[PDB]
RNA sequence: CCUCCUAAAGAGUAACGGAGGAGCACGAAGGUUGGCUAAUCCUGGUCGGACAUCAGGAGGUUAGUGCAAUGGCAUAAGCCA
RNA sequence: GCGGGGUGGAGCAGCCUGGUAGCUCGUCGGGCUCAUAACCCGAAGGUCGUCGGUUCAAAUCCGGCCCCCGCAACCA
RNA sequence: AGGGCUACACACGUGCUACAAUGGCGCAUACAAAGAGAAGCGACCUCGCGAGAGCAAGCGGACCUCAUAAAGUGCGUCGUAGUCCGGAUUGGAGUCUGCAACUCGACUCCAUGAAGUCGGAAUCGCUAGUAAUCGUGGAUCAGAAUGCCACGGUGAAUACGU
């Protein structure tokens, strides 16, 4: 139930429950379950403690949760401190990957700010 | 005064000739230091001429003050109001180009289009001096968009520039100037 | 009393050696541990205060005292004498048992725990820290959590300075960063 | 301690994944199973560039 | 990005300038228009004036800039906000 | 004095103009100085310096 | 009607003199027994911020008194049971 | 001397009885229209004249100061 | 040569993708038309999770290649959740074209996981193989379509009447 410092859902299938970890998607969830030798359709509640321990051991091989968050923060901070074009885009909160700003860009710019 | 002007112009002419000769000598002798010195002298002389030209451009009393620009539509009607809006945009763009700061004190927009009138404050160095010569009526000729037939129509708009003069300091009456009678 | 015996048998000796104390009575002691929940959002619903008090009672094994406003404050819309918090004071056996629980179970369960700050000493040797989610205590059942509660934990110590306080806490392998 | 007002407080066994078992008094009746403890947590255990990457990825 | 099999790209004139600057130990900024050139480790500590379109912005190369194009440190568009 | 200024102002109407902007012929001419240009778009966008400097130089 | 000054170190003392309050409240806010001590600031602390609750320190009544002002109040007259 | 007032851009409420700013027009955005008005659908805008006090807390209670109103200003 | 045409408080038009269960996902398995190809289409085989890479047939084509159509059908799962809906955004690692992917290409992998739960006033298209929905091709083109041009699959409702 408690993996990588967080609680995973108990009533879901194992793959969906493992996706709740920050840094684990469907592909990594399948990889973890395959390396732990557990069927994906088995609910988390229907697992012995040793199986959960094996799941924790398998998850330990990936950079997840706070480690991943601080890695991402370090990368973004490095860009912003370098002051490259991507860093400036991150500073000003505009799309970083060359998307149009004349219209759209609402995900980066937040809700519309009337003049 | 005549000596200031005449000596300034004679020193300008003589210093230009001297700078030309020194530049010829520097370019011939490939002296980088003399070249840089001549460049500095030319820059100083250019600044001197620019300053004199500035005084000549703005001899007027209030040329250094900030100014107010009033734009009023005229004979064209709706076309005139659209033309007045165009003039307002033009003058705002020119002020931005010159670095002056503009604000809209007052404005009356035409119902169909454009503006009936607008009062704009322009603040900057010699703003009134730079803008005073734009006072007058501006005539516009084009195919009026407010004419179903698209006829070629003439429209008139007026720009008036006046300096911002500080309000007079009101002064209380000197008692020696008054005679008081009781009866 | 495992940690109390560990104190009396190892921490006293280590601190005496480190600080060259003449008398054992000069060795710092862990006087008390105070857990406090500021439940200032209970003015709208006193029942939230009751649930927070239940959480604190479960965490500490002790019925909490309800603390009310010392004086009326308009900024937070509180009148004098209005119940806006709860607290527990742990001394002796209960204090040591809670200290062991906190060190060995609760602190490891802190989400993304990177180490407690060693600058959180009050200038006299007492150490205050904050807990953001009571779920770090296994007594709190995850399935029965109504609201994300937090608290603050103050270890009041007879130490005369921050150096002595941090030495005493480190002697218990307190996870300073 | 006043009678009848405090939560029931009796000893239980907390067993962790790393084999650490500690018997401690607590309010919760059932014995505890821990995914992590102070004997195995990465921070407690202590187990918790551009030029290099360039020269590695562009080995000439 | 460019394929790893092709290796990093750098203009030949800029590469020669960087090599000459490193060998000679000169401290004059290297003026260049090659915004598309990759920053190489041997450039670290050099000042390179990269053309932004109308002027050469000085860039003091540090180890964190290695692997990026020189144009990433010379913004080409001027923007200070609307309604200013 | 303000009324004197207001009465001195020229009519915004036919026959009075310091400058003519004819877009069909794509010409702009200042009546006072005679300066004429063909870049009506630039002048409308704010290239008034030619006219202003000509007026100041004329004095 | 109450408090201070005028009022001249007992009382008292005027002016359309200088400043403020009252026309109630409380079955506890009264009696007794037992206990306790403030304002304010600083430091540390989840949300929590200038200001809530917690811990320590400095300070020593600069608080408090149901309501004006004066005189009192630590043996407290202040706070709790 | 005695009374009133001063609050989104304008005109009025909210004060009395402290906690909480409203109405009508106006402004702005989108509609309708060939276009404008009208009309329809949405928004925004006042920390309450100015200081001070009182209060846990003031548009509100108190006191100055400023402006505006009324009255009163007599026998003499 | 470098930069811009790709800016970005904002307003509008044309689209695409959704807001789920008449669906999402996984496995398996049916049925098209039309068209393009020589500095081209490129099979096969091998390597790579993948985009792709290496080697290398055939075809100026009813012959070879692009190139398994998808919706559908069968089984299983999800069980009404901002979800196993949505896939924007962003971090890292790559591929290909191209002298050269920073400004400013496409695509892949891992992570990420926004608004959105059917949209005010108002407004649009369509009368039958039509609307709706599902795939496929082409030109332009080194590379770069949610646009356009074209092709098939499934396949309605309603028209009292002026
Ligand atoms: K862009
Ligand atoms: K007296
Ligand atoms: K009592
Ligand atoms: K589109
Ligand atoms: K649309
Ligand atoms: K989701
Ligand atoms: K590009
Ligand atoms: K819609
Ligand atoms: K193409
Ligand atoms: Mg693009
Ligand atoms: Mg006396
Ligand atoms: Mg006396
Ligand atoms: Mg007497
Ligand atoms: Mg008398
Ligand atoms: Mg009393
Ligand atoms: Mg007593
Ligand atoms: Mg008493
Ligand atoms: Mg208020
Ligand atoms: Mg060019
Ligand atoms: Mg364009
Ligand atoms: Mg999905
Ligand atoms: Mg993904
Ligand atoms: Mg939402
Ligand atoms: Mg839903
Ligand atoms: Mg028809
Ligand atoms: Mg289609
Ligand atoms: Mg094609
Ligand atoms: Zn353990």
mmCIF file of N, CA and C (backbone and C1' of nucleotides) in Angstrom, chain I residues 34-64:
data_model
loop_
_atom_site.group_PDB
_atom_site.id
_atom_site.type_symbol
_atom_site.label_atom_id
_atom_site.label_comp_id
_atom_site.label_asym_id
_atom_site.label_seq_id
_atom_site.Cartn_x
_atom_site.Cartn_y
_atom_site.Cartn_z
ATOM 1 P P A I 34 -10.613 2.181 -58.319
ATOM 2 O "O5'" A I 34 -9.826 3.552 -58.146
ATOM 3 C "C5'" A I 34 -10.503 4.797 -58.204
ATOM 4 C "C4'" A I 34 -9.706 5.883 -57.531
ATOM 5 C "C3'" A I 34 -8.266 6.032 -57.992
ATOM 6 O "O3'" A I 34 -8.123 6.752 -59.200
ATOM 7 C "C1'" A I 34 -8.304 5.974 -55.654
ATOM 8 P P G I 35 -6.965 6.340 -60.229
ATOM 9 O "O5'" G I 35 -5.633 6.897 -59.556
ATOM 10 C "C5'" G I 35 -5.508 8.272 -59.231
ATOM 11 C "C4'" G I 35 -4.396 8.521 -58.243
ATOM 12 C "C3'" G I 35 -2.984 8.282 -58.738
ATOM 13 O "O3'" G I 35 -2.496 9.343 -59.535
ATOM 14 C "C1'" G I 35 -3.235 7.380 -56.568
ATOM 15 P P A I 36 -1.299 9.082 -60.569
ATOM 16 O "O5'" A I 36 0.003 9.075 -59.653
ATOM 17 C "C5'" A I 36 0.378 10.222 -58.907
ATOM 18 C "C4'" A I 36 1.525 9.923 -57.976
ATOM 19 C "C3'" A I 36 2.768 9.345 -58.628
ATOM 20 O "O3'" A I 36 3.598 10.331 -59.205
ATOM 21 C "C1'" A I 36 2.220 8.069 -56.726
ATOM 22 P P G I 37 4.461 9.964 -60.503
ATOM 23 O "O5'" G I 37 5.629 9.040 -59.940
ATOM 24 C "C5'" G I 37 6.630 9.571 -59.084
ATOM 25 C "C4'" G I 37 7.478 8.480 -58.480
ATOM 26 C "C3'" G I 37 8.333 7.685 -59.451
ATOM 27 O "O3'" G I 37 9.558 8.331 -59.737
ATOM 28 C "C1'" G I 37 7.225 6.218 -57.950
ATOM 29 P P A I 38 9.823 8.981 -61.178
ATOM 30 O "O5'" A I 38 11.401 8.891 -61.349
ATOM 31 C "C5'" A I 38 12.268 9.521 -60.414
ATOM 32 C "C4'" A I 38 13.611 8.837 -60.335
ATOM 33 C "C3'" A I 38 14.476 8.942 -61.588
ATOM 34 O "O3'" A I 38 15.845 8.971 -61.200
ATOM 35 C "C1'" A I 38 14.070 6.676 -61.110
ATOM 36 P P A I 39 16.715 10.303 -61.396
ATOM 37 O "O5'" A I 39 17.320 10.581 -59.951
ATOM 38 C "C5'" A I 39 17.686 9.513 -59.082
ATOM 39 C "C4'" A I 39 18.158 10.028 -57.744
ATOM 40 C "C3'" A I 39 17.104 10.763 -56.925
ATOM 41 O "O3'" A I 39 17.390 10.607 -55.536
ATOM 42 C "C1'" A I 39 18.842 12.259 -57.489
ATOM 43 P P G I 40 16.580 9.539 -54.656
ATOM 44 O "O5'" G I 40 15.205 9.360 -55.437
ATOM 45 C "C5'" G I 40 14.112 10.238 -55.217
ATOM 46 C "C4'" G I 40 12.822 9.593 -55.638
ATOM 47 C "C3'" G I 40 12.346 8.458 -54.750
ATOM 48 O "O3'" G I 40 11.633 8.918 -53.617
ATOM 49 C "C1'" G I 40 12.257 7.782 -57.011
ATOM 50 P P C I 41 11.583 8.033 -52.281
ATOM 51 O "O5'" C I 41 10.643 6.809 -52.664
ATOM 52 C "C5'" C I 41 9.262 7.003 -52.920
ATOM 53 C "C4'" C I 41 8.598 5.718 -53.334
ATOM 54 C "C3'" C I 41 8.796 4.540 -52.399
ATOM 55 O "O3'" C I 41 7.940 4.576 -51.273
ATOM 56 C "C1'" C I 41 9.179 3.848 -54.617
ATOM 57 P P G I 42 8.564 4.646 -49.796
ATOM 58 O "O5'" G I 42 8.998 3.146 -49.487
ATOM 59 C "C5'" G I 42 10.351 2.737 -49.609
ATOM 60 C "C4'" G I 42 10.467 1.442 -50.368
ATOM 61 C "C3'" G I 42 11.366 0.385 -49.747
ATOM 62 O "O3'" G I 42 10.703 -0.376 -48.754
ATOM 63 C "C1'" G I 42 11.951 0.659 -52.005
ATOM 64 P P A I 43 11.535 -1.269 -47.712
ATOM 65 O "O5'" A I 43 10.944 -2.730 -47.919
ATOM 66 C "C5'" A I 43 9.577 -2.921 -48.247
ATOM 67 C "C4'" A I 43 9.380 -4.174 -49.058
ATOM 68 C "C3'" A I 43 9.878 -5.453 -48.413
ATOM 69 O "O3'" A I 43 8.954 -5.995 -47.488
ATOM 70 C "C1'" A I 43 10.676 -5.340 -50.626
ATOM 71 P P C I 44 9.410 -6.306 -45.980
ATOM 72 O "O5'" C I 44 10.426 -7.520 -46.135
ATOM 73 C "C5'" C I 44 10.052 -8.696 -46.834
ATOM 74 C "C4'" C I 44 11.260 -9.508 -47.215
ATOM 75 C "C3'" C I 44 12.207 -9.841 -46.078
ATOM 76 O "O3'" C I 44 11.770 -10.954 -45.321
ATOM 77 C "C1'" C I 44 13.444 -9.044 -47.922
ATOM 78 P P C I 45 11.636 -10.843 -43.725
ATOM 79 O "O5'" C I 45 13.109 -11.132 -43.200
ATOM 80 C "C5'" C I 45 13.877 -12.197 -43.737
ATOM 81 C "C4'" C I 45 15.350 -11.916 -43.610
ATOM 82 C "C3'" C I 45 15.795 -11.355 -42.271
ATOM 83 O "O3'" C I 45 15.967 -12.357 -41.288
ATOM 84 C "C1'" C I 45 16.751 -10.086 -44.018
ATOM 85 P P U I 46 15.667 -12.035 -39.744
ATOM 86 O "O5'" U I 46 16.897 -11.134 -39.294
ATOM 87 C "C5'" U I 46 18.215 -11.658 -39.295
ATOM 88 C "C4'" U I 46 19.237 -10.579 -39.045
ATOM 89 C "C3'" U I 46 18.989 -9.706 -37.828
ATOM 90 O "O3'" U I 46 19.418 -10.306 -36.622
ATOM 91 C "C1'" U I 46 19.498 -8.341 -39.679
ATOM 92 P P C I 47 18.691 -9.936 -35.240
ATOM 93 O "O5'" C I 47 19.192 -8.457 -34.928
ATOM 94 C "C5'" C I 47 20.566 -8.191 -34.695
ATOM 95 C "C4'" C I 47 20.839 -6.712 -34.601
ATOM 96 C "C3'" C I 47 19.945 -5.920 -33.665
ATOM 97 O "O3'" C I 47 20.275 -6.064 -32.298
ATOM 98 C "C1'" C I 47 20.143 -4.762 -35.699
ATOM 99 P P G I 48 19.102 -6.111 -31.204
ATOM 100 O "O5'" G I 48 18.519 -4.630 -31.202
ATOM 101 C "C5'" G I 48 19.329 -3.540 -30.794
ATOM 102 C "C4'" G I 48 18.606 -2.221 -30.908
ATOM 103 C "C3'" G I 48 17.207 -2.153 -30.324
ATOM 104 O "O3'" G I 48 17.179 -2.057 -28.912
ATOM 105 C "C1'" G I 48 17.217 -1.118 -32.433
ATOM 106 P P C I 49 16.165 -2.978 -28.074
ATOM 107 O "O5'" C I 49 14.742 -2.684 -28.728
ATOM 108 C "C5'" C I 49 13.645 -3.562 -28.518
ATOM 109 C "C4'" C I 49 12.363 -2.800 -28.289
ATOM 110 C "C3'" C I 49 11.962 -1.822 -29.385
ATOM 111 O "O3'" C I 49 11.236 -2.459 -30.420
ATOM 112 C "C1'" C I 49 11.732 -0.809 -27.239
ATOM 113 P P G I 50 11.558 -2.143 -31.956
ATOM 114 O "O5'" G I 50 11.085 -0.637 -32.153
ATOM 115 C "C5'" G I 50 9.724 -0.259 -31.989
ATOM 116 C "C4'" G I 50 9.588 1.241 -31.968
ATOM 117 C "C3'" G I 50 10.259 1.958 -33.129
ATOM 118 O "O3'" G I 50 9.380 2.077 -34.234
ATOM 119 C "C1'" G I 50 10.930 2.945 -31.075
ATOM 120 P P A I 51 9.930 2.026 -35.739
ATOM 121 O "O5'" A I 51 10.175 3.555 -36.099
ATOM 122 C "C5'" A I 51 9.164 4.524 -35.873
ATOM 123 C "C4'" A I 51 9.753 5.902 -35.730
ATOM 124 C "C3'" A I 51 10.762 6.296 -36.791
ATOM 125 O "O3'" A I 51 10.137 6.770 -37.969
ATOM 126 C "C1'" A I 51 11.605 6.833 -34.644
ATOM 127 P P G I 52 10.736 6.395 -39.408
ATOM 128 O "O5'" G I 52 12.220 6.959 -39.348
ATOM 129 C "C5'" G I 52 13.267 6.322 -40.058
ATOM 130 C "C4'" G I 52 14.465 6.106 -39.174
ATOM 131 C "C3'" G I 52 15.616 5.341 -39.800
ATOM 132 O "O3'" G I 52 16.447 6.161 -40.601
ATOM 133 C "C1'" G I 52 15.128 4.413 -37.695
ATOM 134 P P A I 53 17.053 5.594 -41.973
ATOM 135 O "O5'" A I 53 18.291 4.713 -41.504
ATOM 136 C "C5'" A I 53 19.303 5.257 -40.673
ATOM 137 C "C4'" A I 53 20.241 4.181 -40.196
ATOM 138 C "C3'" A I 53 20.741 3.236 -41.275
ATOM 139 O "O3'" A I 53 21.859 3.755 -41.967
ATOM 140 C "C1'" A I 53 19.948 1.984 -39.441
ATOM 141 P P G I 54 22.085 3.406 -43.514
ATOM 142 O "O5'" G I 54 22.730 1.952 -43.485
ATOM 143 C "C5'" G I 54 23.944 1.706 -42.794
ATOM 144 C "C4'" G I 54 24.251 0.233 -42.760
ATOM 145 C "C3'" G I 54 24.109 -0.488 -44.090
ATOM 146 O "O3'" G I 54 25.266 -0.368 -44.894
ATOM 147 C "C1'" G I 54 22.960 -1.692 -42.421
ATOM 148 P P C I 55 25.137 -0.249 -46.487
ATOM 149 O "O5'" C I 55 24.738 -1.719 -46.950
ATOM 150 C "C5'" C I 55 25.609 -2.815 -46.717
ATOM 151 C "C4'" C I 55 24.889 -4.133 -46.852
ATOM 152 C "C3'" C I 55 24.227 -4.397 -48.193
ATOM 153 O "O3'" C I 55 25.134 -4.872 -49.170
ATOM 154 C "C1'" C I 55 22.718 -4.918 -46.456
ATOM 155 P P A I 56 25.004 -4.385 -50.693
ATOM 156 O "O5'" A I 56 23.570 -4.908 -51.148
ATOM 157 C "C5'" A I 56 23.305 -6.297 -51.268
ATOM 158 C "C4'" A I 56 21.824 -6.574 -51.280
ATOM 159 C "C3'" A I 56 21.070 -6.079 -52.503
ATOM 160 O "O3'" A I 56 21.147 -6.995 -53.580
ATOM 161 C "C1'" A I 56 19.924 -5.413 -50.545
ATOM 162 P P A I 57 20.988 -6.489 -55.095
ATOM 163 O "O5'" A I 57 19.706 -7.270 -55.622
ATOM 164 C "C5'" A I 57 18.411 -6.757 -55.372
ATOM 165 C "C4'" A I 57 17.351 -7.824 -55.442
ATOM 166 C "C3'" A I 57 16.316 -7.622 -56.543
ATOM 167 O "O3'" A I 57 16.688 -8.254 -57.755
ATOM 168 C "C1'" A I 57 15.216 -7.818 -54.472
ATOM 169 P P G I 58 16.627 -7.453 -59.142
ATOM 170 O "O5'" G I 58 15.085 -7.114 -59.325
ATOM 171 C "C5'" G I 58 14.115 -8.145 -59.425
ATOM 172 C "C4'" G I 58 12.729 -7.605 -59.190
ATOM 173 C "C3'" G I 58 12.343 -6.415 -60.055
ATOM 174 O "O3'" G I 58 11.871 -6.795 -61.333
ATOM 175 C "C1'" G I 58 11.888 -5.906 -57.809
ATOM 176 P P C I 59 12.248 -5.918 -62.622
ATOM 177 O "O5'" C I 59 11.216 -4.712 -62.574
ATOM 178 C "C5'" C I 59 9.826 -4.950 -62.421
ATOM 179 C "C4'" C I 59 9.112 -3.706 -61.968
ATOM 180 C "C3'" C I 59 9.367 -2.465 -62.803
ATOM 181 O "O3'" C I 59 8.584 -2.421 -63.981
ATOM 182 C "C1'" C I 59 9.597 -1.930 -60.522
ATOM 183 P P G I 60 9.299 -2.339 -65.414
ATOM 184 O "O5'" G I 60 8.988 -0.862 -65.916
ATOM 185 C "C5'" G I 60 9.595 0.264 -65.295
ATOM 186 C "C4'" G I 60 8.652 1.438 -65.250
ATOM 187 C "C3'" G I 60 8.215 1.970 -66.610
ATOM 188 O "O3'" G I 60 6.865 2.415 -66.531
ATOM 189 C "C1'" G I 60 9.286 3.687 -65.398
ATOM 190 P P G I 61 5.758 1.772 -67.496
ATOM 191 O "O5'" G I 61 5.120 0.603 -66.629
ATOM 192 C "C5'" G I 61 5.720 -0.682 -66.547
ATOM 193 C "C4'" G I 61 5.187 -1.416 -65.349
ATOM 194 C "C3'" G I 61 3.705 -1.182 -65.103
ATOM 195 O "O3'" G I 61 2.899 -2.137 -65.761
ATOM 196 C "C1'" G I 61 4.912 -0.579 -63.177
ATOM 197 P P A I 62 1.508 -1.704 -66.427
ATOM 198 O "O5'" A I 62 0.495 -1.715 -65.203
ATOM 199 C "C5'" A I 62 -0.855 -2.122 -65.374
ATOM 200 C "C4'" A I 62 -1.436 -2.636 -64.083
ATOM 201 C "C3'" A I 62 -0.752 -3.875 -63.519
ATOM 202 O "O3'" A I 62 -0.828 -3.847 -62.096
ATOM 203 C "C1'" A I 62 -3.009 -4.368 -63.976
ATOM 204 P P C I 63 0.507 -3.731 -61.216
ATOM 205 O "O5'" C I 63 1.344 -5.025 -61.615
ATOM 206 C "C5'" C I 63 0.898 -6.325 -61.246
ATOM 207 C "C4'" C I 63 2.017 -7.335 -61.270
ATOM 208 C "C3'" C I 63 3.291 -6.926 -60.529
ATOM 209 O "O3'" C I 63 3.864 -8.072 -59.902
ATOM 210 C "C1'" C I 63 3.806 -7.423 -62.775
ATOM 211 P P C I 64 3.899 -8.183 -58.301
ATOM 212 O "O5'" C I 64 5.080 -7.208 -57.874
ATOM 213 C "C5'" C I 64 6.410 -7.684 -57.749
ATOM 214 C "C4'" C I 64 7.336 -6.586 -57.301
ATOM 215 C "C3'" C I 64 6.824 -5.728 -56.156
ATOM 216 O "O3'" C I 64 7.078 -6.309 -54.892
ATOM 217 C "C1'" C I 64 7.623 -4.340 -57.891
#
